Design an enzyme around this catalytic site. Structure first.
Site, PDB file in Angstrom:
ATOM      1  N   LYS D 153       0.811  -1.209   0.000  1.00  0.00           N
ATOM      2  CA  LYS D 153       0.000   0.000   0.000  1.00  0.00           C
ATOM      3  C   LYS D 153       0.847   1.263   0.000  1.00  0.00           C
ATOM      4  O   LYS D 153       0.525   2.220  -0.708  1.00  0.00           O
ATOM      5  CB  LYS D 153      -0.935   0.006   1.213  1.00  0.00           C
ATOM      6  CG  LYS D 153      -1.925   1.158   1.236  1.00  0.00           C
ATOM      7  CD  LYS D 153      -2.982   0.988   2.322  1.00  0.00           C
ATOM      8  CE  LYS D 153      -2.454   1.371   3.695  1.00  0.00           C
ATOM      9  NZ  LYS D 153      -2.103   2.809   3.790  1.00  0.00           N
ATOM     10  N   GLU D 179      -1.634   8.234  14.063  1.00  0.00           N
ATOM     11  CA  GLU D 179      -0.842   7.150  13.505  1.00  0.00           C
ATOM     12  C   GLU D 179       0.304   6.798  14.439  1.00  0.00           C
ATOM     13  O   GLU D 179       0.718   7.614  15.267  1.00  0.00           O
ATOM     14  CB  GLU D 179      -0.295   7.527  12.128  1.00  0.00           C
ATOM     15  CG  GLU D 179      -0.175   6.361  11.165  1.00  0.00           C
ATOM     16  CD  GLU D 179       0.690   6.691   9.976  1.00  0.00           C
ATOM     17  OE1 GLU D 179       1.260   7.798   9.954  1.00  0.00           O
ATOM     18  OE2 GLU D 179       0.806   5.846   9.068  1.00  0.00           O
ATOM     19  N   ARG D 180       0.802   5.571  14.302  1.00  0.00           N
ATOM     20  CA  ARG D 180       1.872   5.075  15.155  1.00  0.00           C
ATOM     21  C   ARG D 180       3.168   5.828  14.903  1.00  0.00           C
ATOM     22  O   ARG D 180       3.443   6.287  13.793  1.00  0.00           O
ATOM     23  CB  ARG D 180       2.107   3.588  14.917  1.00  0.00           C
ATOM     24  CG  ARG D 180       0.925   2.696  15.197  1.00  0.00           C
ATOM     25  CD  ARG D 180       1.247   1.268  14.807  1.00  0.00           C
ATOM     26  NE  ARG D 180       0.065   0.415  14.773  1.00  0.00           N
ATOM     27  CZ  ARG D 180      -0.783   0.345  13.753  1.00  0.00           C
ATOM     28  NH1 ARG D 180      -0.589   1.080  12.671  1.00  0.00           N
ATOM     29  NH2 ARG D 180      -1.827  -0.464  13.815  1.00  0.00           N
TER      30      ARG D 180
END
Ligand SMILES: Nc1ncnc2c1ncn2[C@@H]1O[C@H](COP(=O)(O)OP(=O)(O)O)[C@@H](O)[C@H]1O
Ligand SMILES: [Mg+2]
Lengths: 469, 127, 54, 465, 114
Positions: D153, D179-180
C-alpha cells in the site's frame, strides 16, 4: 455520643451527629427497639452527617430516635466454646440453647497478611471422587471453586466433602451459609447430630456454624461471609490447627452489595453491578489463605447466573482460585452424575513433577480422546454412524466408556438413587483408565461402567446383565 | 398551489437524513432515547408533514399536492424503525433492489413488493 | 454402471447442500449484526438513565 | 487575559473578565515550557468558557493566567512548507529549524458557496493502467483505499505523488490522523529513498502533517483540518490540482466520539457522538473542485468487526465516489500493483461521463475476467480438456489481460531494476481494445508481464529464445 | 363443551400437522426432500395444502385482484378440514387449493390444470 435519625429510605438510614463523629465501619445501637438493631457506617456527607446500612429491618423507625455508638466494629464472640452452635451476624445465638460464654471478642474487619507471611508448599488432598482426583486434583491449604448454574449439584457436592473429608480430619471445621434457603440449614443441623459431629450433651463437637439466609435484609447478606472467616481466622492464628471452611453460596455476597449501592449514590457499571465490584471481593478473598501460622483448606460454591461464565461476578473469582470444578447442565441432562466438565476444569498441581509422570500422561490422555470425540460428532450428523471407518468407530466407543466411567454413585445421594456409596482410592483411578484406553475392555457394552466404583465391579455388572436374555 | 386550484409535486430527498438531524437536536436537549437512540416523537415528525399532501374537493378549488419521499435502508432492512414508520403512512411503495441493479436490470424495480393502493383506479383506460 | 450413477449423484447432492447452507449463512449474519449493535445501544441507555436520576 | 478555574482530565475551564472570546478560538497558557493550546467549545455563562486541551494537562494550577489570540489556530502555510513535518498547531517536529514563510491561514474555515462548484464531472488521470481504466478517479472526489499491511500500500501512496507532479503539476499533503510513531518514522525514510522528499534543495513534492497516537483526544481530531488548510493554499492561491492523503478515516471518527463524551453529552447509537453526520459534513465538503482548481482525496478505510453497516463506515460511504481494494491473493500471484479488478467500483463509470470509447472497452474486461473465474473451478475439480474450443481462448486471453494490468513503477527503479513507465490514457484504451478481439493472441504470456504500452509488448516477444 | 366435540377435534388435528412440518424445515432446507421417510413425505405433502386452504379472497379486496369475495358457513369449514386430514384429496396439486371458498371449488379448479 448520641445522635439522631434524619432520613430513612429503604435499608439506608441517615444519622446526624452533633459533637462526636464515629469513623467508617463502626456499630451503632438504635435505642428504643425491643430487638437489637445495629447500624454500620458507610459514608461521610459533611456537616456531621453519616450514612449507614442496617443489619435488621427498618420498620417502625421514627425520625428522632437517639442512637448510641460503640467505638469499635461488630465484635462477635469467638473461642473454643462456639463449637456446635448456630450464631447470628452480630454474634447472638439462634440455636435457643443459651448464651455463648467465651472470653475472646474479635472484630470482623481486619487486614490481609503481607507478602512475607505467605506459604509456598503444595500437596495433594485425596477425596475419593473419580472425576476430581484424576483430571483436577485438589490441594491442602488451597482455594477450591465449584462453578455451575442453578440446579446441577453445587450443594450436594459440597455436602459430599463434609461427608468424606471432615470426619477423617484432625482439626476443626467451619460452615458459613450465605444467602441460601432456610430449609437447607435445618437439613444440616439434622444430618450432623445423627452422625455425631455436633454433640448436644458434652464438649466434643468439631463444627461451628454461621448462618445468614435469604430472608434477611440486604445489608445482612454482605457481612455474614466476613463473620464466617473471622471464627476460622481464630483457629489458624491464635491456635495452630488445620482448619477447613465451606462457603455456600458466595455469589450472594456480590449481589447483596449491588442492591444497597444505588441508594448510596453510585453510578452503575456494566450489566448492573456496583463500581467497587472487584475491590471488596478482593478484600475478602485475601484473608482466606495459608500463612506461616496455619493452613485453611476452603471449598466454595459459586452460582453462575443463567449459565454464562462471562458475567462480571463469576468471571473475576477465577483469579482467586487454584482448582476450579466447572459443573455443566449439558452433562447432567445425559444422566452423568456428578456433572463435572472435564474439558473446563483445571488445577495448579497438574504437574508431572508433583503428581508423577504416570498420573500426568493419563490425565492428558483422557482429555485428548474426549476433545477428539467432540469433533467427530459434527460428521455423524450428516453422514451417520455406520458410514464411518473402522478406525474411528473405535475411538468413539473408547470415549463413550470414559464418559460413563467418570460417573460415580455418591453417598449422600442415596435417597435420590437407592444405590450405595462408593469411594475409589487414588491408585485405582489411574489403573482403571489405563485399561480402557489400551483396549483391555473392548468386549463389554457401555452399560457395564455406569454408576460403578472401581474397575472390578465393571465386569461383575457385565455378566449379570447377560443372563436375562 | 393546492389552495388556489393548481397542482403541485414535491420530492423530499431524503427523509432518512432528516431523522438523524432531529435525533441530534433531541439528545443535545437531554431527552430520553428509545429504539436506536431515537426520540419518542419521530412518528409526529413525519406524519404531520406527509398529511398535508391531499386533494381538495371541487368546492375548495380542486387542486392537489403529491408527495414522493425517499428512504434509504441498510442492506435490504425493511424491518427497521424508520422504514416502518413511513410504510405505515404512505399509500404504497416502490422497491429498488441492489441485486437486480448489479445484474444489469435498470431500473431495478422489485415488481413483487411494489404496490399502490388508491392510485390504481386513477389511470388511463388505454393503459 | 450403478457405482458411477451413484457416485455422480453424491457429487451433486453434496453441492446443493453447501449452496443452501451458504445462502442461509448470510441471512443469519445480518441478524447477528443488527442484534450486536442493539445490545451496545440498549445497555448504554441504562447507564445514562441510572446516572441522570441520581 | 483569563484565569483557569477548573481542571478535570483533558478539559479546562477558563474565566474571563471583559474580552470573552467566541467559539473555535485558541488560547495559550502562560508560564509553561511547551505550547499548550486550548480550544473554546462552549459558553457556560457568567463569563466562563469550556475548553479542550491539546497536550498534557498536569502541572496546571487553579488560578493561572491565559492569553487570547483572538483568532483560531493559525498554521504556517506557503510553498516553502513542502518537505517538512508539522503537528496540528504548525510547529515543526523534525529539528530542522523553524519554518519561515509569508502568510498564515486558519483551519476552521467555511465551505465554498453554491455558485463556485464545478458543473461537470471530469476524470483525473494518474498513469496506472488498472486505476485509470476500470475504476477511474474523478477530479475532486473522495477515494476509499481498502487493504492494509503486507499488500503493498505504501508504494501506491508514494507513486501517485510522483505522477501527478509529472503529468499535472500539483503537490500533495499527507495527514497522519492518530498514527503510530514507529510506522510514521518508516514512511519518512521510505520517501527519502525514493526522491519525492529531498533534504538538499526545494524539489520536494509533499508536506507531512503528523498528529501521532499518544496525543490527547482533542489533538487527534483537528489533524485532518490542519492537513486540509495546506491543501487549500495550492488551490486558492496558485490553482494547482492537489492530492490529499488521510490515513485513516476511522481514527478521525473515533477521535470525535471521545471529545463529545468528555464534554458531557448523551451518546447516540452504538457509542458514537450525536453529531456524527455533520463532523463528516463540515470536513469533506471543503474537498471539492472550485473554479480555480481542485482537491482530490485518497482515504484509507478500516471497517470495525467486519460490519459494513456500523455507523462509522456507513457515514463515510455516502461521500466516496470510487473504491479500490488491494487483495493479498493477487500479491501471491506476482502482480504489482495488487489491485483487484473485479471488486473495485466507480461512480463516474458511465457512458455520459467518460464517453462510449472508454465504456465498451472497460465493460468487456470485467466480463471476460468473470468467465475465467467460473471456468477455473471445473478445471480444478474435473479436469482440463472437456471444455469446448471456444472456451480455450477465453482461458488464454484472460491470462494475458490479468498480466497486462501489471506495470513497473518509477519509485522502484533501484530495487527491481526495470524502467518506470507512465502510460497516458489513450494508450490504455487502445491496448485492451485489441487484446479482446484476438489480435495479439499468438504471442506468449511473458511478453505482457511488466511492460508499458502495447508497443513494448511485441518488442519483448523477440527476445524470447 | 362450548364449541362441541367435533369442532374441537378437527381444530386440534390441524395444529398437529402444522407443528410437525415446522420441526422439519431445518432439514429440508439443507438435505432436501429426498432424505425424509416415506410417512414423512405425507406430513409435508398434506400441510402444504392446509396452509393454502387457510387463504381466502376477501370482499373488500375486490379492487386489488379482481376476484370475487367469498363467504363460508361454520358448518362447511369443518367438512373442509376432514376431507384433507383423512386423505380424500391426495390426487390434487397444492395450487388448486389456492384462494377459494369452500371445498367444492377446489375440485372445480384442479380440472382446469389438466
Ligand atoms: N449426586 C448427584 N448427582 C447428580 N445430581 C444430583 C445429585 N444430588 C442432587 N442432584 C440434583 O441436583 C439438583 C439440585 O440439587 P442441589 O445441589 O441441592 O441444588 P443447587 O446445586 O442448585 O444448590 C436436584 O434436583 C438433584 O436432582
Ligand atoms: Mg444450593
Amino acid at each position: 455520643a448520641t445522635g439522631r435519625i434524619v432520613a430513612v429510605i429503604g435499608a439506608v438510614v441517615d444519622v446526624q451527629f452533633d459533637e462526636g463523629l464515629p469513623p467508617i465501619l463502626n456499630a451503632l445501637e438504635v435505642q428504643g427497639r425491643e430487638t437489637r438493631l445495629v447500624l454500620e457506617v458507610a459514608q461521610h456527607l459533611g456537616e456531621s452527617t453519616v450514612r449507614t446500612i442496617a443489619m435488621d429491618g427498618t420498620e417502625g423507625l421514627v425520625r428522632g430516635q437517639k442512637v448510641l455508638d460503640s467505638g469499635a466494629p461488630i465484635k462477635i464472640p469467638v473461642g473454643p466454646e462456639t463449637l456446635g452452635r448456630i450464631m447470628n451476624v452480630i454474634g447472638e445465638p439462634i440455636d435457643e440453647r443459651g448464651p455463648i460464654k467465651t472470653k475472646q471478642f474479635a472484630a470482623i474487619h481486619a487486614e490481609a497478611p503481607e507478602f512475607m507471611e505467605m506459604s509456598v508448599e503444595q500437596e495433594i488432598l485425596v477425596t475419593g471422587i473419580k472425576v476430581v482426583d484424576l483430571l483436577a486434583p485438589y490441594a491442602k491449604g488451597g482455594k477450591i471453586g465449584l462453578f455451575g448454574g442453578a440446579g446441577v449439584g453445587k450443594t450436594v457436592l459440597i455436602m459430599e466433602l463434609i461427608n468424606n473429608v471432615a470426619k477423617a480430619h484432625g482439626g476443626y471445621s467451619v460452615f458459613a451459609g450465605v444467602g441460601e434457603r432456610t430449609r437447607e440449614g435445618n437439613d444440616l443441623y439434622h444430618e450432623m447430630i445423627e452422625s455425631g459431629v455436633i454433640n448436644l450433651k458434652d464438649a466434643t463437637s468439631k463444627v461451628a456454624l454461621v448462618y445468614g439466609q435469604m430472608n434477611e435484609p440486604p445489608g445482612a447478606r454482605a457481612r455474614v461471609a466476613l463473620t464466617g472467616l473471622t471464627v476460622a481466622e481464630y483457629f489458624r492464628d491464635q491456635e495452630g490447627q488445620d482448619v477447613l471452611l465451606f462457603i455456600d453460596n458466595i455469589f450472594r455476597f456480590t449481589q447483596a452489595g449491588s442492591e444497597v449501592s444505588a441508594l448510596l449514590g453510585r453510578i452503575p457499571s456494566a450489566v448492573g453491578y456496583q463500581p467497587t465490584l472487584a475491590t471488596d471481593m478482593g478484600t475478602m478473598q485475601e484473608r482466606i489463605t495459608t500463612t506461616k501460622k496455619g493452613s485453611i483448606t476452603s471449598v466454595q460454591a459459586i452460582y453462575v447466573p443463567a449459565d454464562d461464565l462471562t458475567d462480571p461476578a463469576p468471571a473475576t473469582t477465577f483469579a482467586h482460585l487454584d482448582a476450579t470444578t466447572v459443573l455443566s447442565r449439558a452433562i447432567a441432562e445425559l444422566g452423568i452424575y456428578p456433572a463435572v466438565d472435564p474439558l473446563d476444569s483445571t488445577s495448579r498441581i497438574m504437574d508431572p513433577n508433583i503428581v508423577g509422570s504416570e498420573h500426568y500422561d493419563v490425565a492428558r490422555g483422557v482429555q485428548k480422546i474426549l476433545q477428539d470425540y467432540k469433533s467427530l460428532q459434527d460428521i455423524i450428523a450428516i453422514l451417520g454412524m455406520d458410514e464411518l471407518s473402522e478406525e474411528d468407530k473405535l475411538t468413539v466407543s473408547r470415549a463413550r466408556k470414559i464418559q460413563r466411567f467418570l460417573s460415580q454413585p455418591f453417598q449422600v445421594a442415596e435417597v435420590f438413587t437407592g444405590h450405595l456409596g462408593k469411594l475409589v482410592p487414588l491408585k485405582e483411578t489411574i489403573k482403571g483408565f489405563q485399561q480402557i484406553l489400551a483396549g483391555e475392555y473392548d468386549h463389554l457394552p457401555e452399560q457395564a461402567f455406569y454408576m460403578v466404583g472401581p474397575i472390578e465391579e465393571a465386569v461383575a455388572k457385565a455378566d449379570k446383565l447377560a443372563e436375562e436374555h | 398551489f393546492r389552495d388556489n386550484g393548481k397542482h403541485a409535486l414535491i420530492i423530499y430527498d431524503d427523509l432518512s437524513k432528516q431523522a438523524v438531524a432531529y435525533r441530534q437536536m433531541s439528545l443535545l436537549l437531554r431527552r430520553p432515547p428509545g429504539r436506536e437512540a431515537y426520540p419518542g416523537d419521530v412518528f409526529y415528525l413525519h406524519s404531520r408533514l406527509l398529511e398535508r399532501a391531499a386533494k381538495m374537493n371541487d368546492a375548495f378549488g380542486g387542486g392537489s399536492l403529491t408527495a414522493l419521499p425517499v428512504i434509504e435502508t441498510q442492506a435490504g432492512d425493511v424491518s427497521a424503525y424508520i422504514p416502518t414508520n413511513v410504510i405505515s403512512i404512505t399509500d404504497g411503495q416502490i422497491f429498488l433492489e441492489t441485486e437486480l441493479f448489479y445484474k444489469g436490470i435498470r431500473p431495478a424495480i422489485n415488481v413483487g413488493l411494489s404496490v399502490s393502493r388508491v392510485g390504481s383506479a386513477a389511470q388511463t383506460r388505454a393503459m | 454402471e450403478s457405482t458411477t450413477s451413484e457416485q455422480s449423484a453424491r457429487m451433486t447432492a453434496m453441492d446443493n447442500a453447501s449452496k443452501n447452507a451458504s445462502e442461509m449463512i448470510d441471512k443469519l449474519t445480518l441478524t447477528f449484526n443488527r442484534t450486536r449493535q442493539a445490545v451496545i445501544t440498549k445497555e448504554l441507555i441504562e447507564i445514562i438513565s441510572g446516572a441522570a436520576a441520581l
